Each structure stands twice: as C-alpha cells, then as structure tokens.
RNA sequence: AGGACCGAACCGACUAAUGUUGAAAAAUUAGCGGAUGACUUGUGGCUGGGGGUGAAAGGCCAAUCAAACCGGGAGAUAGCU
RNA sequence: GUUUAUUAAAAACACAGCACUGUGCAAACACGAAAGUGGACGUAUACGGUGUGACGCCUGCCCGGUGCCGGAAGGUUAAUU
RNA sequence: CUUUAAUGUUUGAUGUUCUAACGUUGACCCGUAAUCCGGGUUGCGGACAGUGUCUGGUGGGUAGUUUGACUGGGGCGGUCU
C-alpha cells in the first residue's frame, strides 16, 4: 500500500545524484496522509488515504468518487 | 482546498459566498455538521444562485450557538443526577458524556468527540465549577450541581 | 527475615536468601495459576532482539490487581506469598463477597481488614483514594498516570514516588529514579509503601541467581574483536577508545527520549 | 566424534515437502524447476 | 539447602607415552576434572552468510569455517603468468 | 563454570560486588520495507550497555584532546520569507 | 540617519490557549460471549510529536574504494624539471 486512493499515485523510482553527483538510489515517497472524513448520506466516518496536494484533489473531484473505490476494495469500516 | 463556506460566525464565515480558505477549515471541521459544500466546479454557479433563497432560513440554523454563548457565559446550576457511592464518591462522574448532551446551553449536542481536559471534573456530590466547550474553539465556565440517583 | 550462609564452600561465600516463616512452602493452587511462558528475548522474526535475556526456571505468572481499588468489601487475607515473576510479595486476598483475586501487597496485610474507596472511608494502608484527599508526606502505593491508566509507578518491592508538595492545581511528587513530576489531583492512588520492604537485603552472591531470573551473562566490549563489536580491541586488549554499545550509542551519554506525549507532567528529568 | 547427519525425519518433513511450499509462490518455483528438469524424487519426503 | 568435594554409571580431554602412507572426524592406554548442577540431556521447533548466534576464539553455522552451498550474471577482469 | 571441534583450556572469558551512564515504560535497545513484537507484561529494591573484578585497606591532581550529553542573553549564517 | 512615540500598511517570527484536525503496544462498549483489525466513546496529549518535500550542520555506528615509480631485489632512505 501507501496508495493515495484519490489520484491512484504510489512511490516511484529516482536516483539521488549527490554533491559528488553519485547515482545512489533513494527512491521518492508520497507524504501519504492517513486521513479521516464525514459522509452526510451514511451518517458515518470514513477513512480515505490522501497524499500531499491530495486535499485539493478530493475537493475538486468530489469525496464521492474516492468513497466509491473504498466500497470497491471490499474493506470494512 | 476551497469550498463554499455556509457559516457566518467564528474566525471565518461569509454566509454562502465563495471564499477560499485553508484545508483545516474546509471539509473536516464543518461537514461532520454539513456546513460547507465542495468547490468541485460542477455546481459552483448554481451554489452562488442558491444562497439568495437559502441564507435567511440558514441564519436561524446559525442562531443555535448564540443561545450556548448567552446561557453559559451567564451561568446557573445545570442539575444532573449521577450514581453516588455510599460516601458521595462519584465513581462514574459527569465527565465528557453528561456535559455534552443534557446541558441547557442550547438543549442540543455539540459533537461529543475528543476534548482537552488537563485534569478531571466532578468527584463528589454537590456543586462545582466545570470549564467545557460552549463552542468548538471557546472554553468557558458553566456551574454544575450534582445530586444522587 | 534474611538468612545468610555460613561460607562452607567458594560460590556459597556471599549467597543470601529472603525467607519468612509464614511463606507457603508448597506450589500455588493450580486452577487459579495463569501460565507465564517466556519468549527468551526472541521476537516475531525468530531472532534474539533484546540481548542477553534468555534461560532459567519456568517462573509462573499471576494476573495481579495493580491499583488495589475496591469499595468497602472486607478481605480476610488468606495467604501472603512469594511471587516468581516480580520483586514484591503477592497475596491471595480472599474477599468475603466470595471474590478471589491475586493482589499486590501494600504495607498492609491485616486479617479481616477492608479495602475501602471514597474520601471519608479510606484510611488504613492499602485503601485507595483520589490524590487530592491524601496528605503531604505520604509515600504512596501505585500511582495512576492519568485517570483510568492504572497504577504504573512503584510496583517493585519497597519502592515509592513520594508526595513533596501540593500547592496549585497539581500535586508534586519526587521519584527514586531522580525524576520529579507534577501529577494531576484527579488521579487515584493508595496509602502506605509498597509491600516486601526487606527485598533490598538480597546480595545474590552467585552468577546463577540472575541466570534463573532469565538474565544471561555479557562480555566486555573491549574483550570482543573490532569486527564482532564496534569498540573491540587488538593484541593484548588495548583499552583506550571511548566506550560504546554494540550499535554505536554512547554509554556515558545521550538523552534518547522522544515520548513527547506525557512530557507536560515531567517538570524535571534525569540529566547527563 | 559426532557426525553431521543424525536420525530425525521430523526436521525434514516441514522444511522440504509439498503442501506447505505449494501454498507460497516461491515454493512453487522450486517445485516447477524440479518437475521440469525430470527428477523422479520431487520432495524426497517419500 | 548448597553455581562444594573423591567418584563410577554418564560426559569431557589439562598432561604424558604411542600414532602421524593411524583402526581414528586426536583416537587409544595411564595420570586428570564436571556428575546433590551455571552438570549430564532425549523429543518437537526456530533465526540464513560480513546474516545469524557467541559466559569472546574475529568461535560455529549439512564429515567444512578470519568468509556456507547452489543456480544465473560469466567467456568477471588481468594492466599479469 | 566458558574457551580457537584438532595450538590455550589459562595469565584471556564469566560472575556477585564495585564505579559510570541511559530509561518513567508506546522505555533504553533491537531486528523487521513498516505494521509490528521482544524487553515485559515485568518496570527504578526494575531493565539495557559500559568499565572494573569476591573479600580487607583504598583510589591524590587534571576534560586539555577523544567520543558524547546540555543550556542561554546575542553578533552573523544554508535552505527560506 | 540613530534611538523612537503615535500609528497607516503587507509579509516572516513569537508567546499563551481551544478541540476541531491529528496522536493513542490508555481504557470501555460494539461488530463478536474473535486479546487482531476497524469506527465510536471515554482518559490524556494536540495543531505539537509525527511523516514527506526542500536544504544546511554533525556523524567510521555502517558499507564500497583508495593509499607511487625510480631504486646494483628492496623495505626505509634520498630524489624526480
């Protein structure tokens, strides 16, 4: 995991390229905020995995689409 | 994230006109009580129409917290029955679940949730001072009076 | 009491035991005996991760009531026993309402005495009170950290976390760790010392007493090789680096604390 | 003195049989390569 | 009672004689120490190679250990024989 | 008692004690992709790691450098506004 | 300009404080007469520990490499135009 449920993004490959320009790998990691929300139609709390700049993604698209992928995954809450 | 904020009170509140705001104000503080509508850019022109109709109705739903600010900042004895020991020991106490739901502030809930409480409330029968959430941001005294069940 | 050996062989020269004529010289009554087992310092991985803990005797486990909180039901105190799993003695307390527990000894052990709770009732040793209602100079048994967290401080035989002020909204107490905390008055705590006050007259006198306690021996770092331990020495030991752990931490240094959640209550800490 | 092979087949059976290794991916690739080579003793647990 | 003792059975091998293209994975024969314990120890189980595990020798990890074994990289590379 | 299976079997290793220090327990520490678990479900009369080595008499000067902790009034100071 | 009051104005820093995010190998009810897991509640911390991005200090604890020819062989020594 460490999946941003809302953009479908993940960690991804990338090399450091240090001050001596060395190509040691570090790999880049999404900030991956594990974040709670409220849904008026169920009158319950849902937890959706969000990243950095992930909040503007949930607003502009809608909670509803993200929430339907949690239903699709099979998980309980 | 932006929203279209429908509250009029507190630190931000422009009654149904769009004003872009930080993301801790947007969604999570307001939507557990349905106080904002998303800036999703599918309905935002309708939302800015809808407010002209809505606000005078919406303003009376936003006269709910004013009661609480009247009725606790000028304090009287909130009378609560709780389970006493043989020596007046409040085993059970009032705490967070009796201070939320039976208080005369608006006679309604403020969502019981998490609270900071840096030490207890209520530990023997009789009156005592209890500083609790008349509003989400605003900590103020009520006076309690406890009697036996 | 204490029994010290007459030095009838080497290795029995400095060996000392804790004995009391009242101790049950049986095995405890087993339907109520609640199974220890050890993990010998091995974690989920099947690797030894807390080093040099491993071995010894089976050392069975009792549930123990570690707040001693009870409203007004009398206790006959059916036996006081040695406990193989901690320093302090553990009673089978038998309450007259027909409830059996195992319970941590206080300075009290009185037959037919009652464990009370609530302010006007509690006053004999072992009878629980909210911390507001206990006097200054009191040694205190088993301190609740935050209301509902239970008696996590002073559990080992004869230790205490002594009240030394009570001014303001908090009660100030000092710990035998050298720590000094403020703790809120709404916490529960209990009267008297911790029981088994004679434990401290142990001298062990053989490596085998710690061996049965599940404590394994540990080599000098300066007597390991540089490859086997980061400190390790050369040809004829050659002590003269700065001392280190096997993982690079300074043994005579560091403040390693990052709990950052209960830190409002510690008003002074141990310091280098 | 003492030699490195000794009795107990018990220490073989759960290391080096079938059903518990088929349950995993990696266990199946030992079993795949062995079947594909043409070796008649598939786990030697017989 | 005993991290005590002389000592088989039971386990080890400080030293000595021998062996060294031995019967031998230091065994044998003789002196010798643990065995009322931090001893001797059967069964079932687990950690995977600069990784384990070490009351410490950079010990031991499938007749093997200051660098296990195999299958690919691989016809490594060789400034050198 | 332990010890390089076969060069030591001890002058090294261990230990109670003795000195130094970390840790207030979701501990210090450790290993693991991280959850997590062990420590210990015990907890400062307790647990890790360090130096020294039961016991009698003791341990005078000194932090400079070496590793390491910590504090503050502030001159400047990356990234950064 | 220096110090600087009244104070118009934008942004960076600060204290004190709330619960409303966020934290919970605290506890309780519940799914569930499943110590897990998850939401809730309640005890307590709290816009902080945390983690990512950016970047600078420290740091052999760790891993990969590296550390002259010449020269009556040479180490060393002395010299290299």
UniProtKB/Swiss-Prot annotation, chain A:
One Pfam family here: Ribosomal_L28
**Source superkingdom:** Bacteria
Keywords of this entry: Ribonucleoprotein, Ribosomal protein, RNA-binding, rRNA-binding
**What GO molecular function annotation could you give as one example from this UniProt entry?**
rRNA binding
Keyword presence, RNA-binding:
yes
The record ties this protein, via SUPFAM superfamilies, to: L28p-like
A Gene Ontology biological process term = cytoplasmic translation
One GO cellular component assignment for this chain's record is: cytoplasm
Similarity comment: Belongs to the bacterial ribosomal protein bL28 family.
Q: How does it assemble?
A: Part of the 50S ribosomal subunit.
What is the official name of this protein in its record?
Answer: Large ribosomal subunit protein bL28
The protein's gene is named: rpmB
Curated annotation (Swiss-Prot), chain B:
Recorded GO MF terms: large ribosomal subunit rRNA binding; structural constituent of ribosome
**Which Pfam families does the UniProt entry name for this protein?**
Ribosomal_L9_C, Ribosomal_L9_N
Q: Which Gene3D superfamilies match?
A: Ribosomal protein L9, C-terminal domain (3.10.430.100), Ribosomal protein L9, N-terminal domain (3.40.5.10)
PROSITE patterns found in the cross-reference section: RIBOSOMAL_L9
Q: Name one GO biological process term.
A: cytoplasmic translation
Q: Which UniProt keywords apply?
A: Acetylation, Ribonucleoprotein, Ribosomal protein, RNA-binding, rRNA-binding
Cysteine pairs bridged by disulfides in the record: none
Kindly list the positions at which N6-acetyllysine occurs in this protein. 89
Q: Which residues carry this modification: N6-succinyllysine?
A: 71, 83, 112
Keyword match Ribonucleoprotein? yes
Which residues belong to the signal peptide in this entry?
A: none
Q: Which GO terms describe its cellular component?
A: cytoplasm; cytosol; cytosolic large ribosomal subunit
This chain's function reads: One of the primary rRNA binding proteins, it binds very close to the 3' end of the 23S rRNA.
Quaternary structure, per UniProt, is:
Part of the 50S ribosomal subunit. In stalled/collided disomes (pairs of ribosomes where the leading ribosome is stalled and a second ribosome has collided with it) bL9 in the collided ribosome contacts bS6 and uL2, while it contacts only helices of the 16S rRNA in the stalled ribosome; the inter-ribosome bridge thus formed is different from that formed between normally translating ribosomes.
Task: Return the similarity comment.
Answer: Belongs to the bacterial ribosomal protein bL9 family.
**Protein's name according to its UniProt entry:** Large ribosomal subunit protein bL9
What species does this protein belong to? Answer: Escherichia coli (strain K12)
Curated annotation (Swiss-Prot), chain C:
Question: Domain of life of the organism in this record?
Answer: Bacteria
Per UniProt, what is one GO molecular function of this protein? Answer: transferase activity
| Residue segments, region Disordered | 27-52, 220-272
**GO biological process terms, semicolon-separated:** cytoplasmic translation; negative regulation of DNA-templated DNA replication initiation; ribosomal large subunit assembly
Carries keyword Ribosomal protein? yes
Q: Could you confirm whether the keyword Membrane appears in this record?
A: no
Keyword field? Acetylation, Ribonucleoprotein, Ribosomal protein, RNA-binding, rRNA-binding
What are the N6-acetyllysine sites (modified residues) in this protein? 241
Ranges in coiled-coil conformation: none
One Gene Ontology cellular component: DnaA-L2 complex
* Xref: InterPro entries: NA-bd_OB-fold, Rib_uL2_dom2, Ribosomal_uL2, Ribosomal_uL2_bac/org-type, Ribosomal_uL2_C, Ribosomal_uL2_CS, Ribosomal_uL2_dom3, Ribosomal_uL2_RNA-bd_dom
Composition bias, Low complexity: 38-47
Q: Which Pfam families match?
A: Ribosomal_L2, Ribosomal_L2_C
General remark:
This protein can be partially replaced in vivo by its H.marismortui (HmaL2) or human (L8, from the 60S cytoplasmic ribosome) homolog.
Q: Which family does it belong to?
A: Belongs to the universal ribosomal protein uL2 family.
Job of this protein: One of the primary rRNA binding proteins. Located near the base of the L1 stalk, it is probably also mobile. Required for association of the 30S and 50S subunits to form the 70S ribosome, for tRNA binding and peptide bond formation. It has been suggested to have peptidyltransferase activity; this is highly controversial.
What interactions and quaternary structure are annotated? Part of the 50S ribosomal subunit. Forms a bridge to the 30S subunit in the 70S ribosome, contacting the 16S rRNA. Interacts weakly with S6 in one of the 3.5 A resolved structures. In pull-down experiments interacts with CedA.
Its protein name is Large ribosomal subunit protein uL2
Swiss-Prot record, chain D:
PROSITE patterns for the chain: RIBOSOMAL_L34
Q: Does the keyword Magnesium apply?
A: no
GO BP terms, alphabetized = cytoplasmic translation
Arranged from A to Z, the UniProt key words for this protein are: Ribonucleoprotein, Ribosomal protein
List the record's Gene Ontology CC terms alphabetically: cytoplasm; cytosolic large ribosomal subunit
Name the family.
Belongs to the bacterial ribosomal protein bL34 family.
Task: Read off the NCBIfam families from this record.
Answer: rpmH_bact
Binding partners and assembly: Part of the 50S ribosomal subunit.
The molecule here is called Large ribosomal subunit protein bL34
């Amino acid at each position: 995991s460490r999946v941003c449920q809302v953009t479908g993004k993940r960690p991804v490959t990338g090399n450091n390229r240090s001050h001596a320009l060395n190509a040691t790998k570090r790999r880049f990691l999404p900030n991956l905020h594990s974040h709670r929300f409220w849904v008026e139609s169920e009158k319950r709390f849902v937890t959706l995995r969000v990243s950095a700049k992930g909040m503007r993604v949930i607003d502009k698209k809608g909670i509803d689409t993200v929430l339907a992928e949690l239903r699709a995954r099979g998980e309980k809450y | 994230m932006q929203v279209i904020l429908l509250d009029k009170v507190a630190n931000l509140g422009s009654l149904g006109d769009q004003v872009n705001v930080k993301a801790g104000y947007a969604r999570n503080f307001l939507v557990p009580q349905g106080k904002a509508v998303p800036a999703t850019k599918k309905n935002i022109e309708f939302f800015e129409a809808r407010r002209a109709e809505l606000e005078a109705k919406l303003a009376e739903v936003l006269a709910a917290a004013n009661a609480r600010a009247e009725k606790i900042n000028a304090l009287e004895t909130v009378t609560i029955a709780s389970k006493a020991g043989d020596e007046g020991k409040l085993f059970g106490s009032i705490g967070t679940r009796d201070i939320a739901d039976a208080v005369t502030a608006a006679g309604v809930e403020v969502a019981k949730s998490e609270v900071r409480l840096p030490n207890g409330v209520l530990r023997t029968t009789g009156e005592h001072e209890v500083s609790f959430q008349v509003h989400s941001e605003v900590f103020a005294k009520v006076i309690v009076n406890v009697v036996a069940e | 009491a204490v029994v010290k050996c007459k030095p009838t062989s080497p290795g029995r020269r400095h060996v000392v035991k804790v004995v009391n004529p009242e101790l049950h010289k049986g095995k405890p009554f087993a339907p109520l005996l609640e199974k220890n087992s050890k993990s010998g310092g091995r974690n989920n991985n099947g690797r030894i991760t807390t080093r040099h803990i491993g071995g010894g005797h089976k050392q069975a486990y009792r549930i123990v009531d570690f707040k001693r909180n009870k409203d007004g039901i009398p206790a006959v105190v059916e036996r006081l026993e040695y406990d193989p799993n901690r320093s302090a003695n553990i009673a089978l307390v038998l309450y007259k309402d027909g409830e059996r527990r195992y319970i941590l000894a206080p300075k009290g052990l009185k037959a037919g005495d009652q464990i009370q709770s609530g302010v006007d009732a509690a006053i004999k040793p072992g009878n629980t009170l909210p911390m507001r209602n206990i006097p200054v100079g009191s040694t205190v048994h088993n301190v609740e950290m935050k209301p509902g967290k239970g008696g996590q401080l002073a559990r080992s035989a004869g230790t205490y976390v002594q009240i030394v002020a009570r001014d303001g909204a908090y009660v100030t107490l000092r710990l035998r760790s050298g720590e000094m905390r403020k703790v809120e008055a709404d916490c529960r705590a209990t009267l008297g010392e911790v029981g088994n006050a004679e434990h401290m007259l142990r001298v062990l006198g053989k490596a085998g007493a710690a061996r049965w306690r599940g404590v394994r021996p540990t080599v000098r770092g300066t007597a390991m090789n540089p490859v086997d331990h980061p400190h390790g020495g050369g040809e004829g030991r050659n002590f003269g680096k700065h001392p280190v752990t096997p993982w690079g931490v300074q043994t005579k240094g560091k403040k390693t604390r990052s709990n950052k959640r209960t830190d409002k209550f510690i008003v002074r800490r141990r310091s280098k | 003195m003492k030699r490195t092979f000794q009795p107990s087949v018990l220490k073989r059976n759960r290391s080096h049989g079938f059903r518990a290794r088929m349950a995993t991916k990696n266990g199946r690739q030992v079993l795949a390569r062995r079947r594909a080579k043409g070796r008649a003793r598939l786990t030697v647990s017989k």
